[PDB]
């Protein structure tokens, strides 16, 4: 279990990190990145606080105490403990402003370690070499959980439509592989130690494009190309209460003939393996993302009750009625999380997996409606979000006291009530805040794909059990049985169109 | 455990029943009512079928085997058995076309028998008489569960705004009470044996208007004034597959100086008792209604998959996408039911009550959206629901075979595919079917009131725990603590407006 | 200008009319059909009422006075007179309960007579015969406007996917053509004199399936196969105020070797002619349908204000707020109609055509939202639409006066207020009424196709003018100009993927 | 007609301007304000460009050529010219990024000069002084149109609930009045020459709080307290194409014993005058705001077609279908503007006023839906709006060319396609852009008030003409006539509740 300071020092390691185009020599001290790095350092210190040992840690099999971000659940009760762990962090991060602490990221490994042998059995290797990919996965899992390494996944590929820009193998040899190209998008890249590189199957994916591998962030040839930082380390925290903490950067990564030793490769070369195994990995991101959805909706409804109360509008029945739908928004997200847990079941390896049907459709409920919930919260604000005094306006020796007189409420000071506006403006009306909404839109399986995937499930086919009730009501057999009676009506008849 | 024939005979009892204005001398043989009465007779026979003993019956404490419509649940597992019981009936009734079999109606008593003493303690009696209302409730519960009586609630009052038309006590004496006035609305009235009369508190309710009592349907002075029947006993069942079964009538009831003996009175005269106890009774109607919502959404999505497949439109991506939202509609209802059960807890009397927060908001999710789900299913039909051949058209010696040629599908006959249209038309485009949609709209706490009630709950007050997360993010105390700091800013200052 | 009685007599003509499978010997006297036939008879008498001469008639070129259902508009002011004509009829029919009086149906001819020569020039004829199709159209138009014939279109085909069941030519000779097969759907078929047969292009349509022709309803071999009637000639009009008037039947038509003389053929045999000319005909149905949409929304909002006022709920702010959106629904429909008229322009033949962009998208606004407007109106009703006394209940000597006491409002009697419920139930909760909603859904270009058609218009292409503003903001050329700069960046560079 | 340079110099005038708390000594040179000031300078130069004389100017009555922002329309054709004038500016400002150039602001005066005498007749003056308020208005209008002064309205008051913080008269004398307090919100304050101070009636408004007056921005005692600037004068315009132009600041204004001479007062002291006259002034802001709505929706749909085409998603039918609804969104806004113009009518003074019913409800259509249109456009972007390379990333000597390879499209370069993302991010995902969306939400009569106002109109009362159609269908008199028949049913009867 690492300390914050050990975490911070692990980042000072030669990594090539671009932020808005600017090379960052030291992510732990640069103004664009240091607030977030410090926030993850604090994340690590808290795991060592005895007061939080129950929620944040577990004593594993060999008696060692490890952080719950390494905990594989074996039961419904274990899953519920992981839920409270995720909830701890979403609340600690003020509703979930940072979505990818290690607790959100390391979950992508749980399905690999649970069932490593297919990763090797399906694997695709040149020159008759024999690589022990399942051993590799088991070795990596023991290394990262023993050294408390921080890992971030990079699975999404650039949408190229004869060497593509996508990451691909350009050489295989006795020591390992060389890869060249881009990974399209990952999160917290400058703030972890190693990447979990992978693929989700897309049409046309070749063997040389199928690579799953652990690769350190400071490996020769790897460049992190991150979005500009929206952190405001020097702003007054009354004016910007959240961007002054830091910014969880997102970015791409370019691999300039990166060498990967075989011990770090988990699978190469089988596109079909990309078709079902990485989705079992992201089921676990979806689970924790779906829990965070409920917390965010909780923060929205609470802001809304405090805000409407502060403005004396909470007794308007239209307002009362919209608050009630915000409450329902929150409880819908919560209900899907409970349903997913309660109808979960154990994998062959013994991993208790929440039901992803309820996870994915709970996420769809959030994805479809969150921008309406946010729009409703903003609507409650009125003008305050077009203009609200800064702390400097309130501090002006003459105009300041007059602001505090003119903007106070019945039972709330001007500074406190404006601080409600500025909290809502930070999250939903700034570049800093808009990234949070965009990340939740586009990271994970997005709404349009949840829809398509849903309809490919076995449970929801025309012949699946979901049409049993309607077949009974209509007096039908299955598809094949209806088709048979149509054919005999044609066969038993005199028609010009058959 | 009564037989169907004993049930049917119990109805031939002198009751005064008006259906569309027509006096019905025998509800078991009249064409307007006999289909439904026969459907409840079958409901009773099935409880005696050994094949369904596990789901439909229980062996109670004294070793007697009784129908589950008398089963008080003591645990989460008991609640789950009641759920499967309700589900049995919604599926047997083809998705829930009849909403108030005895299994749906008798649940209003579970909270009375669980906690009868307040009904007497709060009670409101004249002339220094002493009535053992809690004994009365315990006696009634033993009578109705031993004789398998069929009961329907009448709680809703006419919305009068110096003797009102609402039911009220006009005399109290040693034998019992005399009541006079209307009950506004009940269901299955001509098809039960006794009414469960009651009140939900409204502003202005007087003592003499607060009456809770068992009263037999054939009591002197009681008139059932029911809506016209939409049953079609003589239609061809291919043309009208559901109205040919029967019609679950709804109606009002007028009490022309009805005498009620004290042994049948459960509480009189305390308006405040109407404020919280009857809502604990209807929590149990809401529970089963909320389960039925999921079944109905299951029937809708199944009809939609069969229908779009029958029309060759199921591969259009827009259609695929709308089917997926119908699937999600169904799973949202299901998830709220599971969440309500799992977060349930036991009353002081030992009754395991599902969490009504999830029940009520699951109902709100249905109530807000069902007419969009139905509208989507209808949209999938196209023209078929403006005109589709009757069975007589298909049977015409010359035009019939031509209809079967012109309207067949790839892998489905004309008759079978048109039978999909006519199933959807029955439920959603007829008087017979529209009653089902209207009943689900308006019976139970309707959407606008679920909203208002929600916001009166303790969990959702400005100072409740739902604003804890947002208070933490803002750095606030509770309402009283914010008010205090506002006051000192005023107090510590120089303003012209204070 | 025919009389009602001449109209009624024109229907007693040997026609083969099936209604719910039942052969109707005389549509003017049979209970299933006579109410509607009488309603169209009254439609004709009113054109002769001097009081309505201004709105209902015009004095054409040769000095003859004709009904406006034959009026070709030549100007924006003429179009506005046609609008008031359509509005007269939608208001006379109580908001539009019958959608296809002759005024709604004959409009499909306006674009043919305006531009007849392409109908012949494109035409497709066998055996080197020469048919004067444009002469035929001009002759037909003079016949039908001089004899005041009633015409209904049949354009929709059965969706067959080696002689198909669709109508097609099976012989061509010196006298005319023989056709065999179905037309899928028309309206008012038993109540007009001749059909306007036609096609809208679908993929796979053959030459022998492309037929445009006037054919009398009593032609040998033609069978009208209509939906069951929902008319209730014997119901009490207080209980059913609209189905007691009659039912505008919809149906199919089978052609059993129907002979059509050349003088009645307008075009045969060119599928491509079906691709753009019939849509110019239905532009005129869309125009009047779009005006009716506004009237229907007017009737809905008026019912809603009267109803909420009758229930004392009109001052609830939530109700006030929903009434306001119903008002906006009505004014949106109206605004699209005004915009279509004002931006109209004249055809080459001199016909002033309202802008169909605003017509079609005004229709889309109605089609997307009407079932929400109706659902809101129903929600305002409460329980009254589950049960409301019939006139017989109110007339009962003992219970009747008690109903009138219990159901009266502050300032409105029980009978009058229940008559609001029963008006809403007729239109939106019965088989009779549901047909109106279904007809408006599915007749005309439906919403999903309005969407697709919209995006095929020239105005809305990627290179059309609708992207001019955004091209200017981005600093782009047209598609071809952007493509050119992409190519040179590739060409001027060193890449592995080009 | 002023030049840009005369405009810029008029601003260097001693004004007290706070921007984010910082005193701005010269708004024409400070980085926070100079971009916008220069944009209005260009606005003025363009009026003098002969090429734009037709659209931008008019030759008034005395032969003088003036800018159209002073043009009072006298006809439907004049109104259409003003529409094209507003449209010119919304397109010049890239869809309307700046909402309050002088053309948007000076319109608040048109209704005063049209009908000045009530402003004096209603006026409320102390000490028996006689002030010629109508003369004052006529004098001011001649001064501002002759000197081309720039004016911004300040009408909104702080929501104080014994001297309030709201602006109010604290002295009246022979020279004029002294006012003290806040105005709550105005736009472009640092960039105009004089304020148009006024009030909209709120409950409790006193006589001393009713002040309408022209007051120069550099008057002794006036402080402009503006929101922080989101301008980015030093950013690369490829990264931020709109915030590099400037920022139209919004703010409050404090009056520290400001003296106003009588010649600048237009009305004081009659709260009732605030009830209907200022709404006639803002009708003209609403008109131009409503036109801008259509332009913005045009820019959104154009961005969306270019974007989906650039991503190869424009042929997905779901996408095609959502583009079509964006097109409809644009045409709905346009249709309401056309309807408002065409049904306009002339005031008593001769001013042709577009119909505000269609203006306000067209605005409501925008206000209710714009955040869904924006959310749809963002959804089309995918990941590109979480991260897209800056110009520095693209310029990197090694990673740059690789970015251009990996992010290019079929027929569009990487730089051009990313420039689509960054245009959408500027407008809808930054502080700079969010102000535009917030201004359109909250400035003007907002949606919830449009609803309430709508229902107070005469046209939409229970007894108004909108219920005529439904009264006819039901067979009712007016409210008074129904009430009469209810009373006689009570009177002619035997009831216990009357």
UniProtKB/TrEMBL annotation, chains A, B, C, D:
Highest taxon of the lineage: Bacteria
Gene3D superfamilies assigned to the protein according to its UniProt record, in alphabetical order: 4-hydroxybutyryl-coa dehydratase, domain 1 (1.10.3140.10), Butyryl-CoA Dehydrogenase, subunit A, domain 2 (2.40.110.10), Butyryl-CoA Dehydrogenase, subunit A, domain 3 (1.20.140.10)
UniProtKB keywords: FAD, Flavoprotein, Oxidoreductase
Organism: Rhodococcus opacus RKJ300 = JCM 13270
The protein's name: 4-hydroxyphenylacetate 3-hydroxylase
Keyword Flavoprotein: yes
InterPro entries listed in its UniProt record: Acyl-CoA_Oxase/DH_mid-dom_sf, AcylCo_DH-like_C, AcylCoA_DH/oxidase_NM_dom_sf, HpaB/PvcC/4-BUDH, HpaB/PvcC/4-BUDH_C, HpaB/PvcC/4-BUDH_N
GO molecular function (one): oxidoreductase activity, acting on the CH-CH group of donors
Domain HpaB/PvcC/4-BUDH C-terminal: 288-451
Boundaries of every HpaB/PvcC/4-BUDH N-terminal domain copy: 3-265
Pfam families: HpaB, HpaB_N
